[PDB]
Structures are given as structure tokens and as C-alpha cells.
From a paper:
Amplification of piRNA in the ping-pong cycle requires assembly of a tertiary complex scaffolded by Krimper, which simultaneously binds the N-terminal regions of Aub and Ago3. To promote generation of new piRNA, Krimper uses its two Tudor domains to bind Aub and Ago3 in opposite modification and piRNA-loading states. Overall, our results reveal that the two Tudor domains of Krimper have distinct architectures that are responsible for the differential binding of two PIWI proteins.
In the 2.1 Å eTud1 apo structure, crystals belong to the P212121 space group with two monomers in the asymmetric unit. The overall structure is similar to eTud2 apart from the C-terminal region (484-511aa) that forms a long α-helical fold that inserts into the narrow interface between the Tudor and SN-like subdomains. We named this novel C-terminal helical topology the “latch helix”. Furthermore, eTud1 possesses a ‘latch helix’ that must move out of the cleft to allow Ago3 binding providing a potential regulatory mechanism. First, the N-terminus of eTud1 contains a long-loop (spanning amino acids 272-300) connecting and interacting with both the Tudor and the SN-like subdomains. Pro292 within this N-terminal loop forms a CH-π interaction with Tyr365, Glu297 in the loop region forms a hydrogen bonding with the backbone of Ser387, Arg300 in the loop forms a hydrogen bond and salt bridge interactions with Asp394, while Tyr304 in the loop forms cation-π interaction with Arg428 in the SN-like domain. All these intramolecular interactions help to stabilize the overall structure of eTud1. Although the overall topology of eTud1 is similar to other extended Tudor domains, eTud1 has its own unique folding and recognition characteristics. The unusual binding preference of eTud1 is reflected in its non-canonical binding pocket, which lacks three of the four conserved aromatic residues.
Author numbering: 287 to 465, 483 to 511
The structure:
């Protein structure tokens, strides 16, 4: 059975949903070199995403590695509201928001911690986050990477990199890449299997 459609909220574009979610811009100070995970490289939209994945994000990490039980949901939350979705094949649970209704069926959704826009069929297994996790800042910060080969940068997704922050306007970054607990690396391997899944682009996240 499909999830019930959202009862409320304002539908938004991919650019707008990124603007509406909470983001910790203080983690990327200008004129400094910082260590961050290359969350995603969108070679169709040019821009990349960086995530601090700092000790303050520990609750999100616990949900992602299925270390915390969550209440399964049958009613999609409102557009712009934050919840969790299960990638059943790769066994990880990630934070998500529905930004709009799709004309052909389903919805447009944003993976706030990965910086990825995906189609949401409405058959996906979804959960309610506890309020503290729900209120945590989105890990993925939009970043214009300069002086580098973006295509080559795509292979370094889900790895720690060092970036020189040229500009931090408070919604996006202009950064140049420069050429960490054991649990953090283990989590990145778990994320990479979901990200590298051969059918993720075609089917999105699979149910059950």
C-alpha cells in the first residue's frame, strides 16, 4: 500500500528546499582550510556538497547505521518537514524531506545529509525521527568547487577531503580542494554502498 499524501506544507523547488532547511554555515569559515566529507558531486548541476559529520551529528549517524529504533510512518509528513527513509537494499536510514508533488505520480524529495535530489514513489518504508534528530542541521552544504577536475572529484565522494574556503556567503560555499574516528570511516563505507548501488538512479530507495 502507498503512503498517504502530505496533508499540508508549501511545495518548493530544489533550490528553495535547500534554502529552507537549517544549515550550520559556521563549520566552514572563510580564509581557512577545513576537513569535510565530499557528500556528493552533481556533475549534471556542476555544484558539489560537503558535510562536516562532526560529533554533534552523532544522533544522525546512529539512525543511519540502524543503531536506534524509529516509529514507522504510514502518513507522509508535510512538504518541508524532516523524516527518515530506509534504503532497504543497503540497510541504511537517511534524513529526507518532500519538496513537491510529481505530476506523473510520486514526489520530489531531498536527502538533506547527502545533498541529493531523488524521486520518491510513495511506497518507500519511512519513519518519524525523534525531535532532537529532526531539528539537527542538514549536513550537506552546497559548494562551488574551483581549480579542480569535478569529474575526477566524483570518485572521491564519501571520503574526507581538505578544502580552502574562498567564500562563505551563508547559504553556499566557494572552495578549492587541496590535493576522524574509526567509526566515522565505517559509517562512510555504509553510506557509499547505498550511494554506489547500481539501481539507485533508476529506482530510488527500494521498499521493505
Amino acid at each position: 500500500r502507498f503512503l498517504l499524501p502530505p496533508k499540508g506544507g508549501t511545495e518548493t523547488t530544489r533550490r528553495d528546499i535547500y534554502n529552507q532547511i537549517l544549515k550550520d554555515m559556521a563549520a566552514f569559515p572563510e580564509n581557512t582550510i577545513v576537513t569535510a566529507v565530499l557528500a556528493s558531486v552533481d556533475v549534471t548541476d556542476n555544484c558539489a556538497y560537503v558535510a562536516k559529520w562532526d560529533e554533534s551529528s552523532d544522533r544522525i549517524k546512529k539512525v543511519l547505521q540502524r543503531q536506534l529504533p524509529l516509529q514507522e510512518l504510514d502518513q507522509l509528513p508535510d512538504y518541508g518537514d524532516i523524516f527518515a527513509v530506509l534504503d532497504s537494499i543497503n540497510n541504511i536510514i537517511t534524513r529526507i524531506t518532500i519538496n513537491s508533488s510529481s505530476a506523473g505520480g510520486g514526489y520530489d524529495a531531498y536527502l538533506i545529509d547527502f545533498g541529493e535530489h531523488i524521486h520518491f514513489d510513495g511506497n518507500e518504508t519511512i519513519f518519524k525521527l525523534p525531535d532532537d534528530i529532526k531539528r539537527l542541521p542538514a549536513q550537506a552544504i552546497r559548494c562551488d568547487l574551483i581549480n579542480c577536475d569535478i569529474a575526477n572529484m566524483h570518485c572521491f565522494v564519501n571520503t574526507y577531503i581538505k578544502i580552502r574556503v574562498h567564500e562563505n556567503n551563508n547559504s553556499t560555499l566557494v572552495a578549492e580542494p587541496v590535493i576522524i574516528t574509526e567509526d566515522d570511516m565505517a559509517m562512510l563505507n555504509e553510506i557509499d554502498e547505498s550511494t554506489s548501488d547500481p539501481l539507485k538512479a533508476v529506482l530510488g530507495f527500494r521498499p521493505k
